[PDB]
Amino acid sequence: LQFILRRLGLVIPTFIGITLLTFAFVHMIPGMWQQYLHYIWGVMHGDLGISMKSRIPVWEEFVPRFQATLELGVCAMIFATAVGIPVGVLAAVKRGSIFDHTAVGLALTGYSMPIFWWGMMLIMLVSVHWNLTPVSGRVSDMVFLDDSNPLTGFMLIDTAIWGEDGNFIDAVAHMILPAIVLGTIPLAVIVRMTRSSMLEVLGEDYIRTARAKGLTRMRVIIVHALRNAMLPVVTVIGLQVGTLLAGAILTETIFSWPGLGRWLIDALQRRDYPVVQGGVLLVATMIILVNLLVDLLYGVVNPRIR
Amino acid sequence: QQPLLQAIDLKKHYPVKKGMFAPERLVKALDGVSFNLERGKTLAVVGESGCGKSTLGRLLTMIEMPTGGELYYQGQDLLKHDPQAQKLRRQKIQIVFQNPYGSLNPRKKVGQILEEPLLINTSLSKEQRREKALSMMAKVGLKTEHYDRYPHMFSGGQRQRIAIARGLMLDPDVVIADQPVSALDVSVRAQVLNLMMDLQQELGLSYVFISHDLSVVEHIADEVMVMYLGRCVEKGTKDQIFNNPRHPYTQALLSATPRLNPDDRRERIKLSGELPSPLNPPPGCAFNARCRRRFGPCTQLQPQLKDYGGQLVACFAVDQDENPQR
Amino acid sequence: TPLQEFWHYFKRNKGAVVGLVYVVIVLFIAIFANWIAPYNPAEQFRDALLAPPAWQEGGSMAHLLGTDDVGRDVLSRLMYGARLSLLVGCLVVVLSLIMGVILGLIAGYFGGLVDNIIMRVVDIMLALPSLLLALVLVAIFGPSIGNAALALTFVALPHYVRLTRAAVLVEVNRDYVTASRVAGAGAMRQMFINIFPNCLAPLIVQASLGFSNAILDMAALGFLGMGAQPPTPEWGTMLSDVLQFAQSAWWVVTFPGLAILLTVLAFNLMGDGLRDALDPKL
Amino acid sequence: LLNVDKLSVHFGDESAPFRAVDRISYSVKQGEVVGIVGESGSGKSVSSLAIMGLIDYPGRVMAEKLEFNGQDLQRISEKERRNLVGAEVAMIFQDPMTSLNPCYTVGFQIMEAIKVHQGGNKSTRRQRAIDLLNQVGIPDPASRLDVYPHQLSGGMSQRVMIAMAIACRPKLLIADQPTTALDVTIQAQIIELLLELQQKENMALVLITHDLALVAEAAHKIIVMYAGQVVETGDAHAIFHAPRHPYTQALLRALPEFAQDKERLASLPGVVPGKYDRPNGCLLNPRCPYATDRCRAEEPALNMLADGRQSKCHYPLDDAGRP
Ligand SMILES: Nc1ncnc2c1ncn2[C@@H]1O[C@H](COP(=O)(O)OP(=O)(O)OP(O)(O)=S)[C@@H](O)[C@H]1O
Ligand code: SF4
Ligand code: SF4
């Protein structure tokens, strides 16, 4: 109980602050107490505003963007977690090898990467010179789905369950470059943190006890070290998931992706403040719920808290 | 004549949360400690971890305010909210900490560390502060060339020497020493103890010597105060407490202390259990869970310090041994 | 002496010395751009429109890294861009470091209501991604190089506040801060003369990550049009609306991004050198 | 049982190594208690981690002989070392709080130790773990299987380490300062536990500690370490009534037990020699009150004396305390 209650007691003051600053933005930049109550009452009924170019409600624009951003963010974080964790463990276990110097070297290069430029380079190499993978969009303009079906709005699900033959490998081919491009800073940070964490843990007194019990080197690494070295990792993961939208504004623009970052930056370039004002509230909201989820996850894995 | 320092009924309770905001328990880290300290004498405070000896040290050097009781220096009160009392508090009572590695600022030179007290509290010029600091270094056994060096350039003994030298800069007459020789080697330990006895005999200092090592206390002390669960359980001169211990915890603590000479190895009495947590203190006498002499009143009441032949003990079994009608 | 001990350990990281050599070279190119750059960064050579680098068949030594889609020389634009990139990064890091250290000492030393007010404001302005909050402020206040730099200065304060406040709470519990309080030291002396010299090791490394982030985020703002304006030689601005050249003129897409990546990598290499030298790690 | 000969442990570059242990030799019989006494920088703990194979990548170990139970620990395989470590030789370490893995319960950590060597089903293993927690004196062994290490005291943490070390009934137990971190009563409890296990299971015990008085109560034989070298060996009563090395004599005169009420304690000048400071001849040359030009030229042998003791000195002391 008490750990959850202690963290909710910091989330609520933050959510009140986000709501007060969004009310200040909506009052000061047009497209006290009674007006604040009227504003948050409207937001709770879904009245986030009307988008100036389309005249569609901001929530009815948002839902497709959130799905198409979450699908991309999931794939990018799958790439980063799957590839990054094994490499950081091997780098710490093989300290000073050609593998360690290459893993540290490539991670430092990814952590310093201008995301928008590197996606232009992969369009130029993979899509223009080698011609392996499509340059633009979420699925090929060949692909269309009967709207009669209970389509989820996630293309990797929808084109598998209700798609024609050969449409699913199209929905995957369009996903590869956006997921690698968005996943690169997360991958670099997961390699860096997994390595430093593992070298910290491999130097602890309980690893000397694990060796002194006669345990195999693989069991000392996977059972004893990695369970402890994962706690820090969890944190960073949480951090990066919040930062993925930053990378998505840059990534979605070059790949012409339907998405929440492209919708926001087009609104900021238009001065379409109804989309910006509703959008920063929903984005803010998601971040603090994600943060809360992560910290509940950390307090479940961590016995010191549990 | 008033004693140099006098503590009457000192207390320190820290409020704590039982995993919930409402229940408001008190951690009775210290309650009912009282003593008189004379000029040129060592009072040793002895006990195991959790006994209140370090919070007593922090109260006496005024790092923390007490929850109750009185603290007098030469007959005037040190617990007042009064800017005139600062001139007693900072000059006359001083502290030497346990850890030589954490008690010196690692980004200051030794000259800076010793001159900071004089810069804050005194009117001395830059030349006069350096002359006084170099004289204190020479008194404490550091070299004139050490004045430019940072704490990480010194051994644990040389760091405890800088810490003693800093403590003496304002010309004190009470020094509180919180486990001052615990981390040090045998040789370095010896070195350090010889220095503290030389400084007492030269300058007239009185020590409040907080210690876990009874071997060192049998050497440096004049009076010994034995602590259990925030209360004093036995108090008396060194010869009384080491040659005639009357309280069961003092007998157990001396019987558990290892001794090199075979003839001085006392009868082994071995206690059960852990020292109890101060969040959930035992009812009546705090030692009744571990004691070999448990008796009718011990679970019902706290005992009080009484004079039994010139030493004070807080024990109902000693009261019945001296008063058979009890 | 501790500065020679720091330099001795910094020299042990060979990558960090390679980073420092590049930063000195780019700073020299940034200072002397007026004299080194072969042409003015806005001058148009319309007889040599979309001319390739000097090592390709349509090119000449007159334009080493080629020309853009209006005939401007790319080399000169890259080094006047190096000048803007370093001046913005320096202004962002210095202002965010000064204001963040003071608010973090004031939070970590005094505690109580001051720590709660400061840390709730910091947690509110971290409720958005750094770049999204900078974009919103520059879109409220209009896009310009100055506006972008002030937005980047503001959104960076949380990291310096949170790091300094975290370091100060690790020092304030120690016996040397307590011994200084028993000796009579006031709050100003405790913060700036005693605790701050011990917090400075974390901050010297964080300033290198700050330079890297200010360069990446200024280039991101410039790419998205919400930064330096189109005539200016800023590296992200040179990558705004260039993707149609990926087939016909690879040099326009390539070299501004290598200038960013190379510069950020040099500050990140140097930063892990500062980490190896200032921590008791080796 | 254990037979160490010419053992050396080095750190740093081979042109100028830090000789943390330097041509030491000692033997342990089954059922013997051996104390290893020394100050800071003596190499005492390092000599024991070199038996366990716990010296890591920047360090080196070499010996003329390093037999345990008839097997040469220099040339056995990695698998064969794991069949000794925990099963025939076991170790307990200096800090109770850091030495148990904080992510796993006490029962997982003991049942894992039993599994690695003895095997058996879950039930069997759990039974043997309850048996061990009862044997080391835990007040409720069934509930203490389910606690995490941060819920234990220092005393209970060290009892769990002893239960986990003795789980396979080893022939040798090494105790590297097992009680330095603990209160005096808890120290007395843990060392009377170790000596009860030692006598009941007919097990060899190596006590590594700086406390001379604690070893004088516990040990049969004492080995005195200085600057990475053994300087004296002998029976625990004889060694401190009549010391045969000037170092041991100095060491005793520095104890506050060894003096009248408030007379000054003796102490040697100087500091223990590190990598750069190391003297020629005898390593006590800068400090020894009896130093002579022979001592400055020759490294002294570990001289075998008439009563069966050894001291690493050119002039082994008489019973009055003179060369
Ligand atoms: N801030 C605090 N809040 C609550 N309890 C405290 C606090 N500070 C100390 N205590 C308790 O005070 C009790 C009495 O002993 P202490 O004053 O801490 O000294 P001590 O433990 O005997 O000596 P130590 O171990 O060498 S610091 C301990 O059991 C602590 O848990
Ligand atoms: S009062 Fe009772 S419990 Fe306390 S020491 Fe005396 S006999 Fe033991
Ligand atoms: S050999 Fe010489 S210097 Fe060494 S301990 Fe003996 S008398 Fe002293």
Side-chain angles (χ1 to χ4, degrees):
Chain A
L1 270 60
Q2 67 86 9
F3 172 72
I4 299 101
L5 302 179
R6 188 176 181 177
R7 295 308 305 281
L8 290 173
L10 301 178
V11 172
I12 294 296
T14 306
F15 183 68
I16 292 161
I18 291 157
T19 309
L20 288 166
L21 293 187
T22 312
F23 170 69
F25 190 9
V26 170
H27 182 81
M28 296 288 182
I29 307 296
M32 296 310 189
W33 177 243
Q34 296 186 344
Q35 294 76 18
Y36 176 68
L37 264 54
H38 185 75
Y39 174 72
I40 188 54
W41 178 93
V43 169
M44 289 296 295
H45 292 80
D47 191 15
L48 287 163
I50 287 177
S51 183
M52 296 208 297
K53 192 172 70 170
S54 68
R55 305 298 174 100
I56 300 172
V58 170
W59 182 259
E60 180 168 328
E61 292 203 323
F62 175 91
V63 170
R65 321 304 163 135
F66 170 49
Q67 292 189 322
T69 309
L70 182 60
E71 189 165 37
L72 176 59
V74 164
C75 300
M77 213 67 185
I78 294 162
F79 174 82
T81 310
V83 180
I85 304 177
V87 170
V89 170
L90 284 162
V93 170
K94 301 180 180 286
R95 190 182 181 174
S97 66
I98 292 165
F99 187 99
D100 181 32
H101 293 302
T102 303
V104 174
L106 293 176
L108 197 71
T109 305
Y111 181 52
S112 52
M113 195 71 75
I115 289 176
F116 54 96
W117 172 76
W118 196 56
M120 305 175 195
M121 297 298 285
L122 295 184
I123 286 165
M124 190 174 84
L125 274 66
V126 188
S127 306
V128 179
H129 292 302
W130 300 342
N131 198 8
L132 308 181
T133 305
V135 296
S136 163
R138 195 176 176 204
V139 75
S140 177
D141 66 358
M142 178 189 74
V143 178
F144 187 78
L145 299 177
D146 291 337
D147 64 0
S148 62
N149 297 103
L151 302 181
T152 68
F154 292 82
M155 289 287 100
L156 299 177
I157 301 179
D158 297 344
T159 63
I161 304 177
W162 303 280
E164 299 200 319
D165 190 15
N167 292 4
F168 174 71
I169 64 170
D170 193 269
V172 175
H174 277 265
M175 195 65 67
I176 290 164
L177 289 186
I180 292 167
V181 172
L182 179 61
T184 287
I185 298 190
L187 173 58
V189 173
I190 291 163
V191 171
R192 286 177 63 83
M193 187 62 68
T194 303
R195 184 185 183 271
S196 65
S197 308
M198 276 286 297
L199 290 180
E200 277 158 29
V201 172
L202 285 175
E204 283 282 27
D205 295 313
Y206 55 81
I207 298 303
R208 192 170 64 255
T209 306
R211 292 167 68 186
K213 278 186 287 183
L215 288 165
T216 69
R217 195 175 185 182
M218 194 64 70
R219 187 160 174 115
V220 179
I221 289 159
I222 296 180
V223 180
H224 290 270
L226 188 57
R227 172 59 187 272
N228 290 283
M230 278 289 197
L231 312 170
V233 177
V234 168
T235 77
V236 304
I237 292 164
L239 272 54
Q240 289 297 306
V241 294
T243 306
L244 282 173
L245 182 65
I249 295 163
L250 301 170
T251 305
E252 293 174 1
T253 298
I254 60 178
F255 291 109
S256 80
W257 200 256
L260 189 72
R262 193 164 72 98
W263 179 69
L264 279 165
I265 190 59
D266 185 9
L268 289 157
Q269 288 172 354
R270 280 184 260 152
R271 311 294 145 70
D272 205 324
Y273 294 117
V275 166
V276 186
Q277 287 160 351
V280 299
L281 182 60
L282 294 178
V283 165
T285 309
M286 286 163 53
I287 295 165
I288 69 171
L289 292 175
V290 166
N291 292 350
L292 174 63
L293 287 168
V294 169
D295 291 345
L296 294 174
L297 176 59
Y298 179 84
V300 163
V301 298
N302 198 4
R304 284 140 288 194
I305 293 172
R306 197 188 188 292
Chain B
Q1 66 195 351
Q2 306 272 351
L4 174 60
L5 192 73
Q6 166 170 90
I8 302 174
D9 193 18
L10 284 179
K11 298 186 170 74
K12 187 59 174 176
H13 314 317
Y14 306 103
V16 72
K17 301 306 189 180
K18 198 189 178 183
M20 294 182 289
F21 305 106
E24 196 79 342
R25 296 193 63 69
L26 293 183
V27 185
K28 286 143 56 72
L30 190 82
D31 56 348
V33 174
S34 173
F35 66 86
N36 303 312
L37 182 64
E38 292 289 3
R39 185 170 274 111
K41 299 297 181 181
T42 299
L43 172 64
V45 181
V46 302
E48 291 168 311
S49 309
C51 71
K53 67 187 173 180
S54 188
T55 186
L56 177 68
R58 280 176 270 138
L59 292 185
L60 295 171
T61 189
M62 298 148 284
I63 285 165
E64 300 180 26
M65 276 292 293
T67 306
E70 313 184 52
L71 185 64
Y72 291 97
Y73 176 88
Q74 299 200 144
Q76 55 183 323
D77 185 0
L78 264 52
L79 304 181
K80 298 193 303 283
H81 191 291
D82 182 354
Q84 198 68 231
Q86 295 284 349
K87 292 166 57 182
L88 300 176
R89 170 173 294 187
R90 306 198 303 237
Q91 281 76 353
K92 301 303 188 179
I93 309 182
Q94 274 289 335
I95 182 158
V96 173
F97 295 90
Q98 180 178 11
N99 190 319
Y101 311 101
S103 61
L104 303 176
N105 188 331
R107 303 296 291 196
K108 298 293 175 191
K109 298 180 173 179
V110 165
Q112 302 169 0
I113 292 174
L114 298 184
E115 292 172 21
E116 171 161 55
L118 297 178
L119 181 154
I120 295 161
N121 298 282
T122 78
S123 56
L124 297 182
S125 79
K126 187 179 179 181
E127 307 84 354
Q128 291 169 334
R129 291 193 303 256
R130 183 170 183 171
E131 285 183 354
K132 190 162 183 171
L134 290 172
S135 182
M136 196 61 64
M137 290 183 81
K139 194 181 300 301
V140 176
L142 299 174
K143 289 187 285 170
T144 185
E145 72 184 330
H146 292 162
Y147 175 90
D148 296 316
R149 297 188 187 182
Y150 295 79
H152 70 277
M153 305 184 186
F154 296 99
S155 71
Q158 287 167 340
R159 291 187 215 204
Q160 203 68 15
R161 276 172 156 125
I162 301 155
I164 291 161
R166 181 182 63 204
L168 300 188
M169 288 298 278
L170 298 175
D171 305 297
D173 46 18
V174 181
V175 174
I176 290 148
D178 195 350
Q179 296 177 260
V181 301
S182 55
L184 307 181
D185 298 337
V186 180
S187 308
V188 184
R189 181 175 316 158
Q191 290 182 17
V192 170
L193 287 167
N194 287 345
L195 165 72
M196 290 188 295
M197 297 185 293
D198 291 344
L199 290 166
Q200 166 164 84
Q201 184 174 356
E202 180 179 338
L203 301 175
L205 302 171
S206 297
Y207 290 124
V208 180
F209 193 87
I210 290 150
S211 183
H212 70 294
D213 186 346
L214 278 74
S215 75
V216 175
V217 169
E218 191 168 18
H219 192 64
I220 199 161
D222 307 307
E223 186 162 16
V224 184
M225 166 171 280
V226 187
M227 298 286 291
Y228 202 72
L229 201 71
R231 308 202 72 218
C232 178
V233 290
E234 180 152 30
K235 180 184 178 289
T237 53
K238 189 199 84 174
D239 56 351
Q240 293 169 339
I241 307 318
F242 279 79
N243 306 336
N244 190 24
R246 300 197 75 176
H247 183 70
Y249 180 62
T250 314
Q251 294 184 350
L253 185 61
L254 288 165
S255 182
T257 296
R259 288 189 178 262
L260 187 147
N261 183 34
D263 296 350
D264 294 311
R265 295 181 189 165
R266 307 196 82 255
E267 177 175 22
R268 189 79 88 214
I269 56 176
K270 180 159 51 70
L271 301 183
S272 57
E274 290 289 2
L275 194 152
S277 65
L279 282 70
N280 295 91
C285 181
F287 198 59
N288 89 84
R290 310 182 85 188
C291 190
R292 81 183 195 277
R293 302 184 73 174
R294 309 178 80 242
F295 164 50
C298 304
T299 59
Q300 300 183 352
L301 298 171
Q302 273 277 350
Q304 303 296 0
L305 286 169
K306 286 178 60 68
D307 178 7
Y308 297 112
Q311 88 206 66
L312 311 186
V313 286
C315 184
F316 295 124
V318 182
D319 199 24
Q320 192 180 60
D321 191 22
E322 293 287 337
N323 299 298
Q325 71 275 18
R326 198 273 164 276
Chain C
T1 182
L3 183 62
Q4 184 175 2
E5 188 162 36
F6 160 86
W7 177 239
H8 179 69
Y9 269 94
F10 187 89
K11 279 180 60 176
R12 208 186 308 292
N13 190 313
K14 300 299 299 185
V17 180
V18 171
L20 179 61
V21 169
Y22 177 99
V23 170
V24 172
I25 291 164
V26 171
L27 178 62
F28 180 87
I29 291 164
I31 291 161
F32 297 103
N34 284 93
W35 300 273
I36 297 170
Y39 317 100
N40 178 296
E43 185 158 32
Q44 297 179 6
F45 299 104
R46 293 185 180 184
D47 56 336
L49 173 63
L50 285 155
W55 63 91
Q56 300 204 326
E57 297 94 326
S60 70
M61 288 290 174
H63 298 96
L64 291 78
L65 303 182
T67 60
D68 76 1
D69 65 317
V70 294
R72 297 172 298 204
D73 171 67
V74 175
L75 181 61
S76 53
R77 287 178 69 78
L78 289 167
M79 53 188 64
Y80 278 99
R83 176 186 281 185
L84 296 179
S85 181
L86 269 60
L87 265 57
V88 172
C90 186
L91 181 66
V92 170
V93 171
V94 170
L95 291 177
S96 304
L97 186 63
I98 290 166
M99 289 180 281
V101 167
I102 291 166
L103 290 171
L105 281 159
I106 288 170
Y109 183 78
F110 292 91
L113 180 62
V114 179
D115 182 55
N116 189 40
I117 291 171
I118 292 171
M119 296 303 293
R120 296 300 78 74
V121 173
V122 162
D123 293 339
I124 288 160
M125 70 188 290
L126 288 177
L128 290 177
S130 176
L131 184 66
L132 179 57
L133 180 58
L135 285 166
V136 171
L137 291 171
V138 180
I140 290 163
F141 297 121
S144 179
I145 183 157
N147 304 343
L150 291 173
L152 293 175
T153 302
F154 173 77
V155 306
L157 294 169
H159 305 292
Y160 299 99
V161 177
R162 186 178 278 192
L163 179 65
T164 305
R165 186 270 191 183
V168 170
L169 290 172
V170 175
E171 299 311 321
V172 165
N173 72 74
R174 299 175 80 185
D175 295 339
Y176 77 81
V177 180
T178 306
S180 305
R181 189 169 63 84
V182 173
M188 288 290 176
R189 186 169 180 91
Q190 290 277 77
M191 292 183 292
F192 299 117
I193 292 169
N194 291 329
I195 295 157
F196 174 63
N198 291 280
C199 300
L200 181 60
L203 292 165
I204 286 167
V205 60
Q206 185 64 208
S208 73
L209 277 62
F211 248 102
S212 292
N213 294 349
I215 294 166
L216 284 175
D217 298 347
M218 181 64 188
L221 285 182
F223 168 64
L224 300 174
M226 298 293 92
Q229 291 291 75
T232 68
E234 187 283 314
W235 296 327
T237 303
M238 293 180 72
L239 295 170
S240 67
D241 302 342
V242 301
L243 188 52
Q244 71 280 4
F245 302 120
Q247 190 272 354
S248 59
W250 65 269
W251 56 93
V252 175
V253 182
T254 304
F255 295 124
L258 286 177
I260 298 155
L261 172 65
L262 296 172
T263 308
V264 181
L265 179 60
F267 282 105
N268 283 4
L269 278 168
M270 178 191 292
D272 282 351
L274 299 170
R275 199 193 309 283
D276 291 346
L278 296 168
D279 294 350
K281 193 56 55 176
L282 296 173
Chain D
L1 177 64
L2 178 70
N3 186 2
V4 185
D5 207 357
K6 313 303 180 178
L7 174 70
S8 305
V9 184
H10 296 172
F11 300 105
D13 186 88
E14 191 59 21
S15 65
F18 174 43
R19 306 186 192 202
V21 175
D22 179 15
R23 301 190 295 178
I24 73 167
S25 62
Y26 68 88
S27 66
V28 187
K29 295 179 182 177
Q30 195 174 342
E32 189 171 35
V33 188
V34 181
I36 306 181
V37 169
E39 292 187 355
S40 85
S42 57
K44 67 188 195 291
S45 304
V46 173
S47 75
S48 78
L49 295 174
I51 316 305
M52 296 290 292
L54 297 170
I55 304 302
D56 59 354
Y57 181 76
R60 292 180 300 291
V61 182
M62 60 273 289
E64 182 162 314
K65 201 167 185 171
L66 197 69
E67 289 187 352
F68 174 84
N69 195 28
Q71 302 188 10
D72 185 1
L73 300 181
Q74 293 280 268
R75 78 190 72 231
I76 63 172
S77 69
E78 163 60 20
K79 186 181 179 181
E80 189 158 48
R81 172 169 269 100
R82 294 192 307 242
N83 290 357
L84 295 179
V85 172
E88 300 204 332
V89 61
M91 187 170 185
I92 65 180
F93 301 103
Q94 177 179 347
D95 191 334
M97 305 306 294
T98 61
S99 54
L100 291 178
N101 186 331
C103 284
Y104 298 101
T105 57
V106 168
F108 179 92
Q109 300 193 61
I110 297 174
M111 292 186 287
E112 175 184 63
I114 299 158
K115 190 185 178 184
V116 170
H117 302 290
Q118 298 196 332
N121 53 40
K122 294 179 182 176
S123 59
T124 308
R125 305 204 309 278
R126 189 174 178 271
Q127 189 57 50
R128 177 60 177 154
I130 293 173
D131 298 344
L132 288 159
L133 292 192
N134 181 263
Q135 179 170 353
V136 305
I138 300 300
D140 177 20
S143 65
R144 268 68 184 157
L145 294 184
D146 296 341
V147 307
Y148 288 85
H150 68 284
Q151 297 176 297
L152 303 173
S153 70
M156 298 293 166
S157 299
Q158 200 68 359
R159 290 176 187 257
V160 168
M161 284 290 289
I162 295 160
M164 186 181 299
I166 77 183
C168 300
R169 196 187 294 157
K171 299 195 176 193
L172 176 67
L173 182 62
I174 296 171
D176 184 31
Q177 304 172 195
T179 58
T180 313
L182 301 177
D183 299 293
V184 184
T185 309
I186 304 176
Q187 167 164 269
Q189 286 177 2
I190 286 162
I191 285 166
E192 292 194 352
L193 164 67
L194 285 172
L195 296 169
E196 180 177 335
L197 296 171
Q198 191 286 295
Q199 292 177 6
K200 197 173 74 78
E201 304 194 334
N202 196 19
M203 175 181 79
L205 180 71
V206 168
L207 276 162
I208 294 151
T209 185
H210 65 285
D211 191 334
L212 280 73
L214 193 65
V215 179
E217 290 186 19
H220 303 162
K221 177 178 182 173
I222 302 186
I223 298 170
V224 184
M225 297 277 302
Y226 170 72
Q229 300 189 356
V230 171
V231 292
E232 183 160 3
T233 71
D235 302 352
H237 60 290
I239 191 171
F240 302 150
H241 293 308
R244 299 295 189 219
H245 196 280
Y247 178 66
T248 312
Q249 184 184 56
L251 214 55
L252 291 168
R253 289 176 172 176
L255 300 176
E257 181 174 351
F258 210 81
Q260 299 296 338
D261 285 294
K262 210 180 292 181
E263 68 176 338
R264 301 306 189 268
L265 303 174
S267 190
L268 299 172
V271 184
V272 184
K275 186 176 67 178
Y276 300 104
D277 203 24
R278 185 171 157 125
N280 300 97
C282 184
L283 300 185
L284 206 74
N285 270 317
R287 315 181 74 194
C288 188
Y290 316 104
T292 298
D293 292 339
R294 187 176 179 182
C295 308
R296 299 170 180 139
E298 292 180 6
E299 187 192 328
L302 182 57
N303 279 313
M304 186 73 175
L305 309 181
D307 69 359
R309 290 191 282 169
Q310 304 168 306
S311 72
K312 204 181 180 181
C313 187
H314 288 123
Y315 317 109
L317 302 176
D318 73 10
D319 297 353
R322 292 175 62 90

